[PDB]
Write a protein that binds this DNA or RNA. Structure first.
Length: 105
RNA sequence: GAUCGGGUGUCCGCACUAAGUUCGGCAUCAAUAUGGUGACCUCCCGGGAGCGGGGGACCACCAGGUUGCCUAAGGAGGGGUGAACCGGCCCAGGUCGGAA
């Protein structure tokens, strides 16, 4: 249950920094959903599970494309990292916004 | 002192003026030092979230301290709208995050 939280607004380049965005607009994607975040994180070897009805507090869009929250495992509960490539949440958010466009485009 | 010279201001659909009487049109500058506000961009740092700590970049408006290669004149006036989603703020309920 000590898994970090990642919203689709963290990688949304059509959102300002005050609207939820966590990475620059140069390395962010246009409208990533919580299923594109879980699929490209689980495709590198990460422990990710999807909470499809978990919305963002700063998100206002009541429709389905903007809901969702992905919960990623960084530590095996012994303090050690699951992968040495993902030590922080920012290395999980710069990887998913790099592999999401390879899916549909 | 009789007529009466010599000359003006009353009479005009008049000539030109320009203190007022009255309603409109157009128009109404910019740079500095200080602080403030709002946004936005980009980094670190902490967190299971809503979030919290910190470094810069840029934009507009704002207060008021000096000013000008500034005006035909350019107030640091007064007000109103700020909504059907675009100012900021305080935000009931609701609502999203939370075990709270």
């Amino acid at each position: 249950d000590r898994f970090i939280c990642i919203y689709p607004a963290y990688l949304n380049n059509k959102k300002t920094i005050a609207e939820g965005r966590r990475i620059p607009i140069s390395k962010a994607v246009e409208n990533p959903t919580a299923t594109e975040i879980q699929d490209v994180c689980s495709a590198v070897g990460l422990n990710v599970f999807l909470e499809k009805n978990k919305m963002y507090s700063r998100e206002w869009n009541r429709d389905v494309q903007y809901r969702g929250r992905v919960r990623v495992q960084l530590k095996q509960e012994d303090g050690s990292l699951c992968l040495v490539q993902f030590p922080s949440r920012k290395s999980v958010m710069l990887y998913a916004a790099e592999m999401i466009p390879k899916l549909k485009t």
